[PDB]
Amino acid sequence: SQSLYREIHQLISFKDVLPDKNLLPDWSSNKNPCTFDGVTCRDDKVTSIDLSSKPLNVGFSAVSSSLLSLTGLESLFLSNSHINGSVSGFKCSASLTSLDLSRNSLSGPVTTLTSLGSCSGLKFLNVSSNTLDFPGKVSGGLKLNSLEVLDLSANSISGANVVGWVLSDGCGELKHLAISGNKISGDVDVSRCVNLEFLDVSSNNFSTGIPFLGDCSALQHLDISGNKLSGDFSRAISTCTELKLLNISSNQFVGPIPPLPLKSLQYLSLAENKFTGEIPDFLSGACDTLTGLDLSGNHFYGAVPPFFGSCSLLESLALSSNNFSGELPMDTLLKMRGLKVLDLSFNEFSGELPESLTNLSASLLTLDLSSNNFSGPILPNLCQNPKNTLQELYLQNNGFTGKIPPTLSNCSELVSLHLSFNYLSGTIPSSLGSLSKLRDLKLWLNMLEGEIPQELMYVKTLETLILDFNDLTGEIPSGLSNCTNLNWISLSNNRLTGEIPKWIGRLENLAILKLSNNSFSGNIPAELGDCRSLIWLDLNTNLFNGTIPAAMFKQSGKIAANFIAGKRYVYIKNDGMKKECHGAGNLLEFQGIRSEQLNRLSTRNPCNITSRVYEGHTSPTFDNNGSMMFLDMSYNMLSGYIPKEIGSMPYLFILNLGHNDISGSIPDEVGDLRGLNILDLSSNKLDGRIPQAMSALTMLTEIDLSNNNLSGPIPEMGQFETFPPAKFLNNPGLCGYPLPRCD
């Protein structure tokens, strides 16, 4: 057959235009393509090709001429294959059914896809996650009316009535339409698409009309979430009898929960809206089929109605961030056999934990009661039932008292324990080290005393250890060296003593290290510069002495921070008003806690919290090849001179070496820190002239060189003219504006 001779030559030609050789090493001439990797054959004839997740790095023109023209080819999967360029006219095999070009660098107007109409048998098309757009006026049509499945999601499409453009030539055969994650706005009319089952217009710019669904005869999945929609969606979906999933979350809908089609409903999300009232009784109509419910981020109140006990298929119930009050409805919750996730966080649920809660320790994967008015002791009988399935236990930001039950070790599947922000006293039970799967241990802001258990070394999966603001004494356990997956360690505000161990450098995943307000002594380890992930170091208010090692900045430029991202935090800026407040600012973990309860720190901290709070999710300014972003060693007994290597950290935002015994002169390399915002070298024995090179710093919003032996003229260029005289005071030999003219 000529087609067989043609098949092999086209495949090999495609291999040869690949910039990277050896990418398809088993592809070779004078061999049967059915033996090639990525190829699928039926009766010794290629029917499908899959080169997904291979960095092909070639233009679409290569694909179209070599691959899409192959006789008998039924499907082609090139997802995440690093293909760029634009789609354009080409001869397409009439047998081609599915084409996946998702997650690539395809560019140009979305009108380029119309040329795929040369594929007569095309039915499935995935061009999601590319850079396709819609320049200027929207006119004409996509003109692919034979498609059953189309995914234009996560592109750069921006325009009004782009959906109408897609459906202009007809949607009679269309079963699945996803256009999510764009900037499309205007009207959505799928009433002519009588076989439509899946519709996702989420994360767009729709601010006016709700999609018109017509008879809505075949619709099962409807996602309009992540828009600016308001109005009466109830009436719009009222005719949809086959509806299974309804996601209207993150919109501007108001009022009480309206009527919904419940008979086939599996998933329902009303989350992140302006809905009010209490959970109506009529929702019991979904209890036969309802798998998941999310009412979070609204103004709902009252108590969880009793009818929920009839929903035995409900796997997930999220009522977080509302005004639900009363005690824990253990009556209804025990009637739900299939519930694996309970989230009542950020509510006003009050009272002590009922003893029947222990029954859900063998059922629930996630129990989140964080930020509530719960009081009394933590149930010691928690996880009494054998084979406990509990993974996440969030009890933070409550009125819990007493001791941490050592019995919590009986929950062996626990990956996250958050007991922070409570009135818990006693010590940390050493049995917690017996948790082989534990990743996050957060107990901060409690009255916990004693020492940090040495037995924690038996947790090789440990990632975050947050013990801030307790009465913890003793030294850092030598066994923590065995936890190599540690990224976030914060032991600040305790009475901890000893030194930073030399094995600290052996933690290659360590990103944040905060030891402030302790009695830590000794010298700063040179092995701190063996940490490849460290971007945040806060050692302020300790007994550290000796000279700053130059080697600690050795990884500068090599730093890689990845796993640290995505974690919720508060950063409380230091108000320079009060002398009792130390450090540049307080970085603290803040998952599942209200900023409104930050006043609980008032008794434990001298700093004023008023208008100095920054809240977000950890977001490094780089991925690989970065540097330390934060460095604070202020209020210590550090001596010697600042090493010139200090200026090797271009991503450093803040540098506070204030209140030390550091001598010498400010190195000229400080002027190479081009990302620097704050620079506090005040209250030291620094002498000499301020290096003119510091005039190159364009990002400084704050500086303090006061209380030093600095002399000579202040640099006249740069940002020095911006800063007030107060920042240079108590420097006898220092002159020039903002100070008086030199003599």
Ligand X SMILES: *[C@@H]1O[C@H](CO)[C@@H](O[C@@H]2O[C@H](CO)[C@@H](O[C@@H]3O[C@H](CO)[C@@H](O)[C@H](O[C@H]4O[C@H](CO)[C@@H](O)[C@H](O)[C@@H]4O)[C@@H]3O)[C@H](O)[C@H]2NC(C)=O)[C@H](O)[C@H]1NC(C)=O
Ligand Y SMILES: CC(C)[C@H](C)[C@@H](O)[C@H](O)[C@@H](C)[C@H]1CC[C@H]2[C@@H]3COC(=O)[C@H]4C[C@H](O)[C@H](O)C[C@]4(C)[C@H]3CC[C@]12C
By CB under 6 A, what part of segment 96-125 binds ligand Y? none
Nearer Cβ to ligand X (223/440) = 223
Residue 378 CA to chain centroid, in angstroms?
30
CA–CA distance, 633 with 626 (Å, rounded to integer): 20
- Judged by DSSP in three states, 641 sits in strand
Min separation Cβ 72 and ligand NAG, Å: 29
- Cβ-closest position to ligand X: 181
Q: Could you say which of ligand NAG, ligand X, ligand Y, none residue 323 binds, taking C-beta under 5 to 8 angstroms by partner kind?
A: ligand NAG
Query: Residue 619, annotated ligand binder?
Result: yes
Min separation Cβ 595 and ligand Y, Å: 14
Decide if residue 301 touches ligand NAG (CB under 6 A).
yes
Q: For every residue of 66-127, which 3-state class applies, written as one string? A: HHCCCCCCCEEECCCCCEEECCCCCCCCCCCCEEECCCCEEEEEHHHHHHHHHCCCCCEEEC
Min separation Cβ 588 and ligand Y, Å: 10
Per-residue tokens: 93: 């095999």
DSSP lists the bridge partners of residue 342 as 317, 367
* Among the listed residues 536, 503, 479, 505, the one whose alpha carbon sits nearest the alpha carbon of residue 653: 536
Helix (H) / strand (E) containing 237: helix 233-237
Nearer Cβ to ligand Y (703/734) = 703
Decide if residue 333 touches ligand Y (CB under 6 A).
no
Q: Which of 35, 614, 698, 740 binds ligand Y (CB under 6 A)?
A: 614
Q: Which stretch binds ligand X (CB under 6 A): 53-61, 111-119, 267-275, 279-287?
A: 267-275
Decide if residue 84 touches ligand NAG (CB under 6 A).
yes
Binding residues for ligand X, total number by CB under 6 A: 31
Min separation Cβ 530 and ligand Y, Å: 20
Q: Could you say which of ligand NAG, ligand Y, ligand X, none residue 689 binds, taking C-beta under 5 to 8 angstroms by partner kind?
A: none
| CA dihedral angle for residue 683, residue 686, residue 687, residue 689, rounded to 10 degrees | -100
Decide if residue 644 touches ligand Y (CB under 6 A).
no
Min separation Cβ 718 and ligand X, Å: 32
Q: Which of 93, 111, 130, 250 binds ligand X (CB under 6 A)?
A: 250
Check if the beta carbon of residue 271 is closer than 8 Å to that of residue 293: no
Q: Can you point out the beta strands (E) in 576-653?
A: 585-589, 613-617, 630-632, 637-639
By CB under 6 A, what part of segment 519-578 binds ligand Y? 535-536, 569, 571, 573
Decide if residue 653 touches ligand Y (CB under 6 A).
yes
Per-residue tokens: 729: 């005071």
By CB under 6 A, what part of segment 513-572 binds ligand X? 517, 541
Q: Could you say which of ligand X, ligand NAG, ligand Y, none residue 603 binds, taking C-beta under 5 to 8 angstroms by partner kind?
A: ligand X
Q: Which of 35, 88, 619, 625 binds ligand Y (CB under 6 A)?
A: 619
By CB under 6 A, what part of segment 411-450 binds ligand Y? none
Residue type, 423: Y
Q: For every residue of 444-473, which 3-state class applies, written as one string? A: CCCCCEECCCHHHHHCCCCCEEECCCCEEC
Q: For every residue of 244-297, which 3-state class applies, written as one string? A: CEEECCCCCCEECCCCCCCCCCCEEECCCCEECCCCCHHHHHHCCCCCEEECCC
Helix (H) / strand (E) containing 164: helix 162-166
Nearer Cβ to ligand NAG (114/325) = 325
CA–CA distance, 709 with 698 (Å, rounded to integer): 25
Q: Which string of x and - marks every residue 52-91 that binds ligand X (by CB under 6 A)? A: ---------------------------x------------
Decide if residue 348 touches ligand NAG (CB under 6 A).
yes
Query: Residue 394, annotated ligand binder?
Result: no
Min separation Cβ 699 and ligand Y, Å: 7
**What are the φ/ψ torsions at residue 657 (nearest 5 degrees)?**
-110, 25
Decide if residue 485 touches ligand X (CB under 6 A).
no
DSSP lists the bridge partners of residue 589 as 569
> How many other CB atoms are found less than 10 A from the CB of residue 610?
9
- Judged by DSSP in three states, 704 sits in strand
Contact residues for ligand NAG, defined by CB under 6 A: 57, 59, 84-85, 158, 160, 183, 185, 205, 207, 301, 323, 325, 348, 521, 545-546
| Binding stretches for ligand Y (CB under 6 A) | 512, 535-536, 569, 571, 573, 585, 587, 614, 618-620, 629, 653-654, 677-678, 701
Which parts of this chain interact with ligand X (CB under 6 A)? 79, 102-103, 126, 128-129, 149, 151, 154, 176, 181, 202-203, 223, 225-226, 247, 249-250, 267, 269, 272, 493, 517, 541, 582, 602-606
Binding site per annotation, positions:
569, 614, 619, 677
Annotated binding-site residue numbers for brassinolide: 569, 614, 619, 677
